[PDB]
Every structure is written in C-alpha cells, then in structure tokens.
Design a protein around this ligand. Sequence first.
Ligand SMILES: *[C@@H]1O[C@H](CO)[C@@H](O[C@@H]2O[C@H](CO)[C@@H](O[C@H]3O[C@H](CO)[C@@H](O)[C@H](O[C@H]4O[C@H](CO)[C@@H](O)[C@H](O[C@H]5O[C@H](CO)[C@@H](O)[C@H](O)[C@@H]5O)[C@@H]4O)[C@@H]3O)[C@H](O)[C@H]2NC(C)=O)[C@H](O)[C@H]1NC(C)=O
Ligand SMILES: *[C@@H]1O[C@H](CO)[C@@H](O[C@@H]2O[C@H](CO)[C@@H](O[C@H]3O[C@H](CO[C@H]4O[C@H](CO)[C@@H](O)[C@H](O)[C@@H]4O)[C@@H](O)[C@H](O[C@H]4O[C@H](CO)[C@@H](O)[C@H](O)[C@@H]4O)[C@@H]3O)[C@H](O)[C@H]2NC(C)=O)[C@H](O)[C@H]1NC(C)=O
Ligand SMILES: Cc1cc2nc3c(=O)[nH]c(=O)nc-3n(C[C@H](O)[C@H](O)[C@H](O)COP(=O)(O)OP(=O)(O)OC[C@H]3O[C@@H](n4cnc5c(N)ncnc54)[C@H](O)[C@@H]3O)c2cc1C
Ligand SMILES: Cc1cc2nc3c(=O)[nH]c(=O)nc-3n(C[C@H](O)[C@H](O)[C@H](O)COP(=O)(O)OP(=O)(O)OC[C@H]3O[C@@H](n4cnc5c(N)ncnc54)[C@H](O)[C@@H]3O)c2cc1C
Ligand SMILES: *[C@@H]1O[C@H](CO)[C@@H](O[C@@H]2O[C@H](CO)[C@@H](O[C@H]3O[C@H](CO)[C@@H](O)[C@H](O[C@]4(O)O[C@H](CO)[C@@H](O)[C@H](O)[C@@H]4O)[C@@H]3O)[C@H](O)[C@H]2NC(C)=O)[C@H](O)[C@H]1NC(C)=O
Ligand SMILES: *[C@@H]1O[C@H](CO)[C@@H](O[C@@H]2O[C@H](CO)[C@@H](O[C@H]3O[C@H](CO)[C@@H](O)[C@H](O)[C@@H]3O)[C@H](O)[C@H]2NC(C)=O)[C@H](O)[C@H]1NC(C)=O
Ligand SMILES: *[C@@H]1O[C@H](CO)[C@@H](O[C@@H]2O[C@H](CO)[C@@H](O[C@H]3O[C@H](CO)[C@@H](O)[C@H](O)[C@@H]3O)[C@H](O)[C@H]2NC(C)=O)[C@H](O)[C@H]1NC(C)=O
Ligand SMILES: *[C@@H]1O[C@H](CO)[C@@H](O[C@@H]2O[C@H](CO)[C@@H](O[C@H]3O[C@H](CO)[C@@H](O)[C@H](O)[C@@H]3O)[C@H](O)[C@H]2NC(C)=O)[C@H](O)[C@H]1NC(C)=O
Ligand SMILES: *[C@@H]1O[C@H](CO)[C@@H](O)[C@H](O)[C@H]1NC(C)=O
Ligand SMILES: *[C@@H]1O[C@H](CO)[C@@H](O)[C@H](O)[C@H]1NC(C)=O
Ligand SMILES: *[C@@H]1O[C@H](CO)[C@@H](O)[C@H](O)[C@H]1NC(C)=O
Ligand SMILES: *[C@@H]1O[C@H](CO)[C@@H](O)[C@H](O)[C@H]1NC(C)=O
Lengths: 467, 467
Amino acid sequence: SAFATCLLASVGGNSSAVAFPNQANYSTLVAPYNFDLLTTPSAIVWPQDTQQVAAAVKCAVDSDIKVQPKSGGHNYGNYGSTTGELSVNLDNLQHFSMNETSWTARLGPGNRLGRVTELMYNNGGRHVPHGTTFTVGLGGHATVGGAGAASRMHGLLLDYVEEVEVVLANSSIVRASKSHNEDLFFAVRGAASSVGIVTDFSIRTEPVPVSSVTYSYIWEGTDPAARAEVFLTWQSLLAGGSLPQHMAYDLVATANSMILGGAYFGSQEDFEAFNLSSHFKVAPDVTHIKTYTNFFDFSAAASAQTKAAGIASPSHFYAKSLVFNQQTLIPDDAAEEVFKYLATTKNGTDLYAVTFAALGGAVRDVSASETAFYHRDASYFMFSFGRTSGDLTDTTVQFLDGLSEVLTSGQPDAYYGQYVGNVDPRQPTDEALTGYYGKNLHRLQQIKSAVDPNDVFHNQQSIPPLS
Amino acid sequence: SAFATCLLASVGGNSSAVAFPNQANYSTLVAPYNFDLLTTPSAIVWPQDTQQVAAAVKCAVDSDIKVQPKSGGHNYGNYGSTTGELSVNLDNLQHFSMNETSWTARLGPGNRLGRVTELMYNNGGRHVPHGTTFTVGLGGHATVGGAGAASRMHGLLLDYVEEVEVVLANSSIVRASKSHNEDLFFAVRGAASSVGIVTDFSIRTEPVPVSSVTYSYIWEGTDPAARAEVFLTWQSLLAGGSLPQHMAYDLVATANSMILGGAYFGSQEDFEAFNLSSHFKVAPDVTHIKTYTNFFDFSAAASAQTKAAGIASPSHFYAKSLVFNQQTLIPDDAAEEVFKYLATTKNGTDLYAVTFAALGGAVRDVSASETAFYHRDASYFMFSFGRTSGDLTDTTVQFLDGLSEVLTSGQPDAYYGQYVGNVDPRQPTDEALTGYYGKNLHRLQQIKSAVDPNDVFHNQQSIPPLS
Ligand SMILES: *[C@@H]1O[C@H](CO)[C@@H](O[C@@H]2O[C@H](CO)[C@@H](O[C@H]3O[C@H](CO)[C@@H](O)[C@H](O[C@H]4O[C@H](CO)[C@@H](O)[C@H](O[C@H]5O[C@H](CO)[C@@H](O)[C@H](O)[C@@H]5O)[C@@H]4O)[C@@H]3O)[C@H](O)[C@H]2NC(C)=O)[C@H](O)[C@H]1NC(C)=O
Ligand SMILES: *[C@@H]1O[C@H](CO)[C@@H](O[C@@H]2O[C@H](CO)[C@@H](O[C@H]3O[C@H](CO[C@H]4O[C@H](CO)[C@@H](O)[C@H](O)[C@@H]4O)[C@@H](O)[C@H](O[C@H]4O[C@H](CO)[C@@H](O)[C@H](O)[C@@H]4O)[C@@H]3O)[C@H](O)[C@H]2NC(C)=O)[C@H](O)[C@H]1NC(C)=O
Ligand SMILES: Cc1cc2nc3c(=O)[nH]c(=O)nc-3n(C[C@H](O)[C@H](O)[C@H](O)COP(=O)(O)OP(=O)(O)OC[C@H]3O[C@@H](n4cnc5c(N)ncnc54)[C@H](O)[C@@H]3O)c2cc1C
Ligand SMILES: Cc1cc2nc3c(=O)[nH]c(=O)nc-3n(C[C@H](O)[C@H](O)[C@H](O)COP(=O)(O)OP(=O)(O)OC[C@H]3O[C@@H](n4cnc5c(N)ncnc54)[C@H](O)[C@@H]3O)c2cc1C
Ligand SMILES: *[C@@H]1O[C@H](CO)[C@@H](O[C@@H]2O[C@H](CO)[C@@H](O[C@H]3O[C@H](CO)[C@@H](O)[C@H](O[C@]4(O)O[C@H](CO)[C@@H](O)[C@H](O)[C@@H]4O)[C@@H]3O)[C@H](O)[C@H]2NC(C)=O)[C@H](O)[C@H]1NC(C)=O
Ligand SMILES: *[C@@H]1O[C@H](CO)[C@@H](O[C@@H]2O[C@H](CO)[C@@H](O[C@H]3O[C@H](CO)[C@@H](O)[C@H](O)[C@@H]3O)[C@H](O)[C@H]2NC(C)=O)[C@H](O)[C@H]1NC(C)=O
Ligand SMILES: *[C@@H]1O[C@H](CO)[C@@H](O[C@@H]2O[C@H](CO)[C@@H](O[C@H]3O[C@H](CO)[C@@H](O)[C@H](O)[C@@H]3O)[C@H](O)[C@H]2NC(C)=O)[C@H](O)[C@H]1NC(C)=O
Ligand SMILES: *[C@@H]1O[C@H](CO)[C@@H](O[C@@H]2O[C@H](CO)[C@@H](O[C@H]3O[C@H](CO)[C@@H](O)[C@H](O)[C@@H]3O)[C@H](O)[C@H]2NC(C)=O)[C@H](O)[C@H]1NC(C)=O
Ligand SMILES: *[C@@H]1O[C@H](CO)[C@@H](O)[C@H](O)[C@H]1NC(C)=O
Ligand SMILES: *[C@@H]1O[C@H](CO)[C@@H](O)[C@H](O)[C@H]1NC(C)=O
Ligand SMILES: *[C@@H]1O[C@H](CO)[C@@H](O)[C@H](O)[C@H]1NC(C)=O
Ligand SMILES: *[C@@H]1O[C@H](CO)[C@@H](O)[C@H](O)[C@H]1NC(C)=O
C-alpha cells in the first residue's frame, strides 16, 4: 500500500497502468512465456516514458523490493516477472526514429523484433542483425546478444548498439557508450538485466541485402547412424571454412528428421553453385530453395517458420543451451552416442528439437572482453527444447539434462558456455553464471557492485555483487 | 650405472658429452643463470644431432628420470637444469641454411639470437622479429614466443616458425606444422618446454628494414609523482592508438630515471617529425637518436646495451612479470602509490628496474587460440628485475611481490597475465600456470596427455596432464 500508492503516482494516476496481485486478470497480465514456471510479481507497472521508469524503480527501493524489467516476454525463466519483485513492463516505450544521414535509428525497449524489422526496412531499406522470432522484445534481446540470419555476416545486434539510456538502481538516468560510462556500457551489452533498465537504444544499421536465399534440405529417418553422418558432415563442413561467411547455417534435429537450413545473401545462382548438399554422403529427401528480394518478407517468413514448427509460442517446455568452439567440437564417436541417446531415451515430449546455429564470421570480429558477451570464438550454438502437451515432468528434464551430458561427453571436463538469452533455470546458480558470462563474470561483479550495490535488479541468475 | 652407461651410448661414447654430479667440471657445466635458484640435474648430455636427442630421452625414460632440454639458458628459474632431471644441452645443434628462393631458414635450437640475427642478414639481408638480447637461445625462445623490436610491425618470432622437428617423450621423432600434427604444433609455439624437444626449426624471414632509428629520452630524478606523471603519460600515450605501427615503445624505470626507449623503422626526419617527446608534460633531461642503416649493427648495439644495463646477465636476482590491456590499464590513483612504494620500500637490491614494453601492432593478427601464446590481446608487459650483491634475501623477494601488488591495486582481482619467457619460481604453481598459459591451460593439458602421458618433460611449473 505505501508501495501501491506511489506506484500509482509513478504512472501519474493512470490506474490502468499499474496492477496488483489481488485482482483477477493478474494471472493473465503477468503473461508467462513458460507455462510451468509461473510467477507472481509484487506489482506490475506500465511506465510511459523514462522518468516514469525512474520513478517506479524508486517505489520498489523505498519498500525494499527488487526489480526486473519486462520488454517482450521471452525469458524462459519468466524472470521479467520474478515473484515478489517489481515487474516493469516496457510495452509503452516503443519509440522509433531514423537518421537519414548516419543511418542510426533510435528505438525503445518495448519494440518487438517484428516491428523493428518493418520500420528499419520502410525507413530507408535498412536492417540489423538480430533473432528470427518476431515476438522477441528488443529490450531483452539487444542486451543479451541477439543472433540470427545476418550474424555470421554482420555480428550480434549488440555490436550495432552505439549508445543506451540506462535507468539505474538509485534512479539516476545516465547514458552509456564506448566513450562515456564505458564500464556500464560493457555490462549493458550482454548483461543489462542485472545493472539497470535500458530505456532507449541508439543502434547503427546496415543496408538490407538485395537477394536473400532461404534453403532447406531434409533427411527423414529415425536411424542414428544416418543422422550422425548428417551432423558430422555439417559440423565438419563448418569447421572447414569452405563455407561462405555471409551465409547463415542452421541444423535442426527433431524426433524423425534432420533439417539443414539457412540463408545465403547473394544470387540464388551462386548458392546452388556451392552445391551445398553435394558435400553430404547421402542426398536429402526434400529441397526447398526460395529467393526473396524484399528483405522484410525474408524475415517475416522465417519468423513465421519457427512459430509454425511449434518451438516459438508460450507453452509447457524446458530447454538448455551449449556453446561449442574449435577445441570443443563433438567427436565422431560422441556424435553416434548422441543420436543413439536421442532415439532411445524416454523424453516425455509432444515435440522436441535440437538446433545447431552456426556462429562464426563477423561475430568473431569483436573482443571476447569488449562486450559482456563472452562466446565470440564460438563455432556453433546448441539449443535444446522440449515441449510437453502436459505439464512438464521430471522425465523431460532428464531427457534434456542427459542430452547436454552426452553432447559434451566427448570432452566432458572442458569449458562449455551457455547463451544467456536461453536461460536454464534448472541448474545450480553457480554453474549458470559460469556458462552465461564465462571469464567476464568477474568484471561484471566489479560493475554490478559499483552501479547497484544492493541487488535492486535481481533474478535467479543475475550477477551478484562482490564480497 | 645403468643410466650412466646408456647415456654414454646415446652420445656414441664421447665421454665429454656426458657430465655427472660426481665430476668437478659439473657445477660450471650446469651454468646457472639465476644464482639463487641453483640446481643439480642428475646428468647433462650433449647430443650432436636429432638421433642423439631421441636416444638421450629414452635413457632418462628407461630409468624413470625426467627430462628438460637446455638451449640458451635464460630461464630465470634455471628450468633447463632442473634438479635430478636429465639436462639435454643442445649446444651442438647450431645448424643453419637459407633457401634463397623462399627466404625461409632452417636452424637448430642451439643458435643464440646473436648468431641468428647475423647469419640471416649475411645470407640475403633477412631478419625475423625476436628478443633484443643476443645470448638468448632460439630453443627456449621461439617456443615461449619471442618479442622484441620488430614485433608490433611483424609479429612474434613464432608467427614465422613454419615447420618443426620434435623428439616426443616416447623418443619418436616427428615433424609438425599448421597442416600436420597440428595439435602438437600449437603446443610447440607456446609451451614446447612441456611437450617435446625441438631439434630443428623452419623459420620464414622478412627482408631487413632499410632504416632503423634507435632513440631514447631520460628523466633523471627521484620524485615519485614526477615519475608517475612520466608513466601515466606513457600509459595514456600508447592507448591513444596515436603511435605508428612500425615503432617499438619501451619505458624503463630505475631508482632515478624514466628512460623512454624504442626503435623506429623509416627515416629519422619522420620520428622527429612525430615529436614523440612533445606529448609529454615535463620535457626530458636528455635525448639520443642514432640512425642505423645496417640492421645487424642496430640489433647488436641494442643487445649490447641491455647487457650494460646490468639486467641481462647471470646473477643473484629475482624477477616477475604481469600483462596489461585496455581493461586493467593502471589507474592514476594507484600508479602514484607504485612510485611512492619504489621510493620508500627497503628494496634490498643494488639495482632494480621495471620495463614496460608495448605490444599489439601485429601481435594481434593471431588469435590467442591459434598458438599456445594466449596473452595476444595485450597492450604492454611489465618485467620487474631486482639484482642483489650476494645472495637473494626475503627482503628483495618481498619487495617485488609488494611491488607486484601495488601495481595491481588498480583492480586487485582482474586477470593479470604473466609471460612464460620470464618465469617466476617463487609463487605457487597453480598461480603460475594460470598466469603463463591461461585460457589454453586446459587445451594444452589435453595435448600434454596425448603426447606425454607420463609427464617426461617436467619442470616446476610445466603443463600437467588431466585428472
Ligand atoms: C493508461 O495505461 C494504459 C496502458 O499503460 C494506456 O493504454 C495503452 O496505450 C495504448 C492506448 O490505447 C495502447 O496501444 C496499443 O494497443 C492497441 C490495441 O491493442 C494497438 O492496436 C496499438 O497499435 C497500433 O498503433 C501503434 C502506434 O502507436 C503501432 O506501433 C502499432 O503496431 C503494434 O501492433 C501490435 C498490437 O497487437 C503490437 O504487438 C506491436 O508490437 C506494435 O507495437 C499499431 O499501428 C498499440 O500498440 C496500449 O495497448 C495500451 N495498453 C494497455 C491498455 O495495457 C492508457 O492510454 C493510459 N491512459 C492514460 C495515459 O491516460
Ligand atoms: C547513482 O548511482 C550511480 C552509479 O553508482 C552513480 O554514478 C557514478 O557516480 C560516481 C561518483 O559520482 C562516478 O565515479 C567517478 O566520478 C567522478 C567522475 O570521473 C569520471 O569521468 C572522468 C573523465 O570525465 C574519468 O577519468 C573517470 O575514470 C570517471 O569515468 C570521478 O572524479 C570519481 O573519481 C574519484 O572517486 C573518489 C572520490 O569521488 C576517489 O576515491 C578517487 O580517487 C577519484 O578522485 C569517480 O571515478 C561514476 O562515473 C558514476 N557512474 C555512472 C554510471 O553514472 C551516481 O552518483 C548515483 N546517483 C545518486 C546517488 O544520486
Ligand atoms: C521463441 C524464441 C525464439 C528466440 N530466438 C532467438 C534467436 O534466434 N536468437 C537469439 O539471439 N535469441 C533468441 N531468443 C532469445 C531472446 O534473444 C532472449 O530470450 C531475450 O532475453 C528475450 O528478450 P525479451 O525482451 O523478449 O524477453 P524478456 O523476458 O522481456 O526479457 C529477458 C530478460 O531481459 C531483461 N530485460 C528486458 N528488457 C530489458 C531492458 N529494457 N533493460 C534491461 N534488461 C531488460 C529482463 O529483465 C529479463 O531478465 C528467442 C527467444 C524465444 C522465446
Ligand atoms: C636478458 C634476457 C632478455 C630477454 N629478452 C627477451 C625479449 O626481448 N623478448 C622475449 O620474447 N623474450 C626475452 N627473453 C626471454 C626468453 O625468451 C626466455 O627467458 C626463454 O625461456 C629463455 O630461452 P633459452 O632457450 O635461452 O633458455 P633455456 O633455459 O634453455 O630454455 C627456456 C625453457 O625452454 C625449454 N627449452 C629450451 N630449449 C628447448 C627446445 N629445443 N625444445 C623445447 N623446450 C626447450 C627449457 O627446458 C626451459 O624450460 C629474455 C631473457 C633474458 C634472460
Ligand atoms: C520423443 O519425442 C518425440 C517428439 O516429441 C515423440 O514422438 C512424438 O510425440 C508424441 C508421442 O506421444 C506424439 O504427440 C502427438 O501426436 C498427435 C499429433 O501428431 C497429437 O494429436 C497427440 O495429442 C493428443 O493425442 O492431442 C489431443 C488433441 O490435440 C489432446 O487432447 C492431447 O494433446 C492428446 O495427448 C500427441 O500430442 C507425436 O505425434 C510424435 N511424433 C513423432 C514424429 O514422433 C516420442 O514419443 C518421444 N519418445 C519417447 C517419449 O520415448
Ligand atoms: C665430444 O665432446 C663434445 C660433445 O658435445 C664436443 O665438444 C664441443 O666441440 C665444439 C665444436 O667442436 C666446441 O665449440 C666451440 O668452442 C669455442 C668456444 O669459444 C667456439 O668459439 C668455436 O666456434 C667452437 O665451435 C665446444 O667447445 C665443445 N663443447 C664441449 C661441451 O666440449 C666434441 O666435439 C666431441 N668430440 C667428438 C669426437 O665427438
Ligand atoms: C633502492 O634501489 C637502489 C638501486 O636499486 C639502491 O641503491 C643502490 O644501493 C647499492 C647499495 O646500497 C649501491 O651499490 C653499492 O654497493 C656495491 C656492492 O659492492 C659497491 O660496489 C658500491 O658501494 C655500490 O655503489 C648502488 O650504487 C645503488 N644504486 C643506485 C642506482 O642508487 C637503494 O639502496 C635501494 N633503496 C633501499 C634498499 O632502501
Ligand atoms: C609416440 O607418441 C606419439 C604421440 O603420442 C604417437 O603418434 C600419434 O599417433 C596417433 C595414432 O595414429 C595419432 O593420432 C591420430 O592419427 C590419425 C590422424 O588423425 C588417426 O587416423 C588416428 O585414429 C588418431 O586419431 C597422432 O597424430 C600421433 N601424434 C603425433 C604427434 O604424430 C606415436 O605413435 C608414438 N610412437 C610409438 C608409441 O612408438
Ligand atoms: C484488469 O482489472 C482491473 C480491475 O480489476 C480493470 O480496471 C482493468 O480494466 C482490467 N484489465 C483489462 C480489462 O484489460
Ligand atoms: C551437385 O552435386 C550432386 C550430388 O553430389 C551431383 O549430381 C553433381 O556434382 C551436382 N549436380 C549438378 C551439377 O547438377
Ligand atoms: C669435464 O669432464 C672431464 C673430467 O673433468 C674432462 O675429461 C672433460 O674433457 C671436461 N669437459 C668439459 C666440457 O669441461
Ligand atoms: C617539436 O616540438 C618542439 C616544441 O617546442 C619544437 O620546438 C620542435 O621544433 C618540434 N620539432 C622537433 C623535430 O623537435
């Protein structure tokens, strides 16, 4: 109530821009993305502008309550709605301006990737490297890393972040950039969730590609040996360097299929001239190759595609991540043991997928320690996702847990990272911060401690301050 | 007896190619570089060629004895003469030849840097980046990394080593390169000390620069703030990215002087043109700028100068290192305490010196994962030498340790790299390993277990196999 009364004041009266757990729509406003890890925030507030985020944050500090902003909602732990914390919903901070001269656009955190793409296209045929899912909010994406079709070509979205507006724990409003509050700006570019609320983004852009070529080779068949041949091929090609740099290169494995897919930027001619499927021992069953000029159509198509697969909507699920680089590639034996594992473990899923997103090229162009993002030298990501038509059961966890154990069990005591966009709230808090942040974890405790000594910005796997 | 007989065999009966501790020659054959960390190896063997290294190594292996090769001898611990281990003195492996066509040279490990410099110039006016001191042996140099005048313009020494010949701890003789036993080639170029004896190098060469421009600026005086000013201008001048690529940039500090050393590759007008001195506050008490057209003369004065410096000789001494970078660029507050500490701490020396030396330039055309050399994103090193009239005492140990700290008070807990060419045997071992190799400590620990499971090539701080 002391808290409930100024939180009304932060949003200048508007009773429809603030909401408390006693009401009945509260379950539905909290809008959980993971259907199993339901959370009850202490309140929810929809600030209008930056002073209102500053105000709301003090409201929580005055009543010893911790804070997590929610932009787009896609955190698998639902940390945007951390229970008994203030949930600052940024859906109104959706501003977008473009500079026809620098081509540096200026967006608010509540912009969802779909609207960032439509606007950067319409306002001067621009785009920027980012993820494929159009419902990903920008606030939580530019700040964790943001990889996608154009990443091997151009890098992480956060490489194109030039300046941010940060609201701090003590409610100050600062800017940050490579020239001004360097350290803060280091943490906001990979770990913003733990140091402040980013309420506006200066993001450089690229010009869109003239010809985007999607491609989708398939192999049906539940035979481990054939599947490990596909994988080992893909992994070995990638580790080749025979591949083009400006070519995205995914590989998704379901129960019953292997899906080499990706996008090449350049003419459909030259792609086929790479005869990409030749390099594989067995030929694929199906071959979808499409060439888009309109780049927003390429983007919305691929956003649509992941949604239709069933791995992009709020659901009952659990998922984990892994980073593999040159030193840590998966052995020939290990592969076989893997797909062997997949075929024969009860998994408990109405649908599962395992994605191998390639991740070299322009991503390597930035120092491991220049951003909070640590995995610059990574060769490919591994995201594992287990949907269940029922509630999640401890069956499905062990399936995915074991899937990580086997995937690394070709070198199990080495260093494997995790993407902090694909949080995994089913693992020891100590193990998490290590995979997420790796060696940057300590500099991050240095900064955390200095711009948020209490833990005002806190979640299950937030960065905790020094001792 | 068994061991001694086999070992006379390995050198084909030349009984003056084997030295045992019972002989009066012995103490001196060991030829200790540090006079405090003395040592007694359980034999010294002087092989003529590869076949005799390989046979020498098995003699040790068959008597459950461990092995270290000696080349130049510049290991501050005296690791080539480790106590109770076999010392494989490579003095007789000074083979040289230059292919005019490729200007690639094929040397043996015994070649000191002096002889290497000379023989390259003379056979086609070639050189190859390396340490300034001429008494350093190629053997334990091109394997730890090897940096001197032309590194920020051409790279480390090991960035020119093409192929190698290696005696593996099972006495097999194998070659290595980027496209052959690559897992080995990696470890040879960073911590050969740990994985084999190299008995032949294939180094590419550059042609010699037509004009070299040694220079120096001296700030006599003991005022610590006055000096600290000197340095913090020096730290700030390097980080500006203002300086040329083809130009080294030292800065040494003693009990009363701040010598700003370096070279420059080009004409004299220009180096003065640049007015290196200008950027500084108090102008320098003294200046020299000699121009060497002849490069060997240039290298040979440089080497010879370090000798007269007093540091680069066998002696009673102790000495340590630290790497630094944009992120731990020492702060102004502590930088003062440094010189106040230098000026105030009972240093127990008769001569002390603290060498900051630039890096980057081209040192960063090679990923830290591409050689066993991991501190490749460094801005500058620090070598702290501290000599003593007669035996070393705790007083002097502690002085450099304390100094080591008072440098680190900047961010006392950040990752501070040590340099493996400047070893430090008065710190705990876990401490060392992480300093020398860091990120790669693991990957080397793989390769070490593949090609030396029984840890035949061991020194007080050598890479170990996994557990
Ligand atoms: C009191 O508080 C409430 C909430 O804080 C205030 O109401 C909020 O603000 C506006 C006012 O109605 C609402 O606007 C959004 O919702 C509409 C209905 O769903 C959308 O149609 C609308 O979109 C259109 O206009 C935008 C231009 O501003 C444009 O960006 C839109 O594209 C959007 O499309 C979808 C919508 O499904 C969205 O997911 C996309 O990401 C994209 O942004 C489209 O052209 C607005 O997006 C807002 O919903 C509403 N929030 C509530 C009620 O919770 C109310 O005004 C305050 N009273 C005051 C201040 O006095
Ligand atoms: C809300 O929290 C914010 C985060 O905690 C607070 O902001 C931080 O405030 C501190 C203190 O104001 C800032 O620290 C520095 O402050 C000044 C500014 O120096 C800076 O700019 C210089 C050049 O422009 C650079 O050379 C510096 O490296 C630095 O970037 C400095 O004078 C300070 O140094 C002094 O610090 C103490 C005494 O203050 C001494 O021990 C030192 O020896 C030295 O004399 C600090 O380095 C910090 O920049 C700032 N950070 C951000 C992100 O805003 C904010 O105060 C707080 N708001 C409240 C409480 O209302
Ligand atoms: C279906 C799906 C597909 C995805 N695909 C990709 C992909 O291809 N590539 C990729 O890189 N990632 C991908 N992601 C992951 C996404 O990048 C991250 O999960 C990110 O955390 C989601 O951002 P959000 O704002 O939408 O989520 P949220 O839950 O709102 O935010 C996630 C975290 O960021 C914090 N945060 C939110 N807004 C701010 C802000 N303004 N300032 C500071 N902290 C803030 C929150 O507090 C929370 O801790 C995908 C996620 C999903 C659900
Ligand atoms: C005065 C001085 C100046 C220096 N200046 C520089 C400089 O400017 N730049 C720079 O980069 N370094 C410099 N060094 C460092 C030098 O590279 C290292 O100290 C190096 O380890 C010593 O080489 P060494 O072969 O002469 O001595 P050693 O003690 O014989 O060898 C050093 C280590 O390598 C091992 N080793 C030797 N030969 C072989 C071989 N053939 N195969 C495998 N392992 C082997 C030895 O076992 C030992 O542990 C300097 C050293 C000194 C003493
Ligand atoms: C390993 O994982 C794979 C993929 O998850 C499993 O095989 C797949 O999982 C399910 C096996 O039970 C099958 O699930 C769905 O089948 C049909 C659609 O094809 C679907 O209608 C079923 O749902 C209902 O029967 O649907 C109704 C109406 O929608 C609801 O009342 C409720 O959802 C019902 O339960 C069922 O959800 C799936 O078809 C199947 N596909 C393939 C290609 O294998 C393996 O079983 C897993 N291995 C294990 C568990 O050992
Ligand atoms: C048996 O003993 C030795 C085996 O290692 C070896 O002696 C070495 O001989 C080399 C060259 O013959 C000498 O090298 C150099 O000596 C002076 C010193 O200033 C240099 O200026 C010269 O250029 C010369 O090349 C070494 O002094 C010597 N080393 C040792 C340890 O004795 C013998 O050649 C071996 N003899 C046989 C028959 O095998
Ligand atoms: C801090 O370091 C200074 C240099 O590292 C040191 O000054 C040096 O002091 C020694 C001995 O006090 C002098 O050496 C003298 O001793 C030798 C030994 O035989 C004799 O031949 C001579 O008497 C010789 O001069 C050095 O000359 C002197 N060097 C310099 C540059 O000052 C300080 O003593 C140290 N401060 C302390 C320990 O508080
Ligand atoms: C002495 O030790 C040597 C290293 O420990 C060892 O050489 C190693 O031999 C293995 C076995 O072939 C090689 O490993 C790989 O060789 C090829 C190339 O990938 C594959 O076909 C194999 O299945 C295996 O994965 C190593 O490359 C090789 N190491 C080096 C440095 O050449 C010798 O065999 C040992 N000699 C003895 C015991 O007499
Ligand atoms: C949520 O409930 C409050 C009152 O409990 C109501 O005023 C508000 O309009 C509701 N949200 C809607 C209808 O979206
Ligand atoms: C592409 O590769 C296929 C499969 O290996 C093979 O038929 C041929 O080399 C290429 N196809 C063409 C040229 O039509
Ligand atoms: C030292 O060892 C023996 C005995 O002193 C002697 O014959 C030999 O020639 C000497 N060799 C060296 C290198 O001093
Ligand atoms: C460098 O700057 C000084 C500043 O007084 C000036 O006198 C001098 O002429 C400039 N050029 C050279 C080559 O010293």
